[PDB]
Structure formats: C-alpha cells, structure tokens
Ligand SMILES: OC[C@H]1O[C@H](O[C@H]2[C@H](O)[C@@H](O)[C@H](OCCCCCCC3CCCCC3)O[C@@H]2CO)[C@H](O)[C@@H](O)[C@@H]1O
C-alpha cells in the first residue's frame with residue numbers, strides 16, 4: 087500500500103469524486119492525517135451516532151430513559167425499517183431504537199429518535215451545545231440522503247465529525263455509562279462491522295457506523311487500532327462519484343489498508 091495520503095489521492099483519481107478523511111488519536115485529539123477535512127460531505131446514516139449522543143445527553147439530564155417504550159404506527163414508517171416494522175404492536179424502547187438505528191441502520195428508528203430530540207433543528211442545536219458549529223441536520227430519513235451537488239443540508243466535515251465523536255465518547259459531556267453505551271452500539275454494528283472484521287488482520291479493533299446516499303455518497307465513522315484497542319477515530323466520506331457501491335467500498339478499504347501498513351506516524 088501507498089502512504090495514507092497518497093492512497094487517499096489515488097482513490098479520488100480512481101473514483102473521480104471527492105474524498106474527505108481524518109485520522110485522529112481518540113485519547114488526545116491529535117490529528118494524524120487530514121484531507122479535505124474542512125470540506126462538506128453528506129452524513130447519510132452516520133448522523134445516527136450523533137443522534138444517539140443527543141438521546142444519551144437527555145438520559146443523563148433525567149429527561150429521557152433508555153427503558154422508555156415508544157409505541158408507533160405503520161403510517162409512521164419510512165423506507166428500510168428492518169427492526170422497527172417488527173414492533174408495531176409492542177413498541178420499542180428508546181435504547182432499542184438507538185441499537186436499531188446504529189447497528190441495523192433502521193431509518194424509522196432514527197426518525198422516532200429524532201422526534202424526541204426536537205427534530206433536525208434540535209439535533210443541530212445539540213451539536214452547537216457541544217461546540218460543533220459546522221455539522222447540521224436539516225431533514226429526516228430518507229430525504230437527508232439526497233446529496234445534491236453543492237447543497238449544505240445534512241452535512242458535516244471530516245474534522246467536525248471526528249471532533250464531535252471524540253467529544254461524545256471521551257470528554258465527560260456524557261456520563262460514564264452513556265459514553266460506554268454509545269461505544270458499545272458502534273462495536274455492535276451489524277451492517278459493516280462483521281464484514282470489516284473479516285478483512286482486518288488479527289489484533290485490530292473495529293467499531294463503526296457506515297452510510298450511503300445518492301450521487302455516490304458513502305462514508306464511515308470508525309474507531310480502529312492494533313492491540314485490540316480503539317486507538318484512533320477514522321472518518322472517511324466520499325461524494326460525487328459515479329462508481330459502483332463495490333468500488334466505493336474497496337476504495338475505503340484501500341485507505342484502511344494504507345493506515346494499517348503505515349500505522350506508526
Ligand atoms: O502487515 C500488516 C498486515 O498486512 C496484511 O493485512 C492486510 C489485510 O490482509 C487486508 O484485508 C487489509 O485490507 C484493508 C481492510 C480495511 C477494512 C476497512 C477499514 C475501515 C476502518 C476505519 C475506517 C476506514 C476504513 O489490509 C491489511 C493491510 O494491508 C496482512 O494480511 C496481515 O497479515 C498483516 O498483519
């Protein structure tokens with residue numbers, strides 16, 4: 087593999103699209119690699135991690151309980167509700183909804199949670215409260231995936247998303263139990279976690295949330311490290327490429343390979 091930056095560049099050349107990437111030490115916030123780190127990319131389903139950070143903040147304040155059962159109706163459901171469509175009769179707890187959103191990318195679960203935090207405007211307000219002045223959510227699932235060229239709606243930057251994830255996971259804004267819960271949801275991702283593990287060398291930790299949207303949009307927010315440790319946050323977004331999903335996946339994996347082969351920097 088090339089050095090990480092050279093691999094990132096190669097991925098742009100091959101995809102004809104923009105890549106944005108940060109590699110950051112989880113414990114300290116040291117930025118190791120940055121590419122288009124201040125440029126905007128659609129969050130797609132990666133927003134669901136920040137969403138459940140906002141839910142957890144409400145739990146910590148005594149304004150929410152992960153146990154609380156939410157009952158909902160079939161007419162509430164949007165496209166791709168693998169977990170939530172199973173629970174029309176019995177409902178789902180707030181914690182189950184976050185598990186479904188983060189680990190299954192259940193869109194209706196995400197919208198049910200978004201309602202509880204004041205919708206897209208409420209989530210954006212929460213982001214501002216934790217000092218992210220850049221990331222914004224404007225729409226609900228599934229319109230937030232539109233990825234229109236030049237549209238600032240529903241975007242983050244690699245730098246802001248990495249800093250925000252670090253704040254949620256480590257900064258004691260959330261309680262110890264809540265930090266542990268958010269981490270565990272990412273560890274438990276079923277959409278990409280097992281696939282990623284199948285290609286990672288033995289000894290490498292992964293926790294993640296992935297996303298995909300229109301116009302080639304694709305992304306991952308992850309924790310990665312050797313010695314079975316979540317050493318670094320890695321955030322990679324792709325936009326405005328006509329490439330197949332398989333090719334987008336393989337380019338992201340190629341960037342991962344470059345990081346793994348050149349880890350000590
Ligand atoms: O010397 C380092 C390693 O080099 C190879 O490992 C390869 C591995 O066989 C391949 O499957 C992976 O693909 C990359 C898979 C990455 C998966 C996605 C990563 C995510 C995680 C963080 C967010 C962005 C991308 O590359 C590594 C590095 O060459 C050897 O197989 C392995 O025995 C050795 O320990």
Ligand SMILES: *C(=O)[C@@H]1/C=N\C(C(=O)O)=C(\COC(C)=O)CS(=O)(=O)[C@H]1C(=O)OC(C)(C)C
Pocket residue numbers: 130131132165166191192193228231277296297298299300
């Ligand atoms: C988040 O990025 C997305 C959310 N849900 C979703 C869907 O709306 O269909 C997913 C579909 O997963 C598949 C391929 O079965 C999860 S996802 O991460 O792939 C994503 C998304 O919208 O994906 C596309 C529909 C754009 C492929």
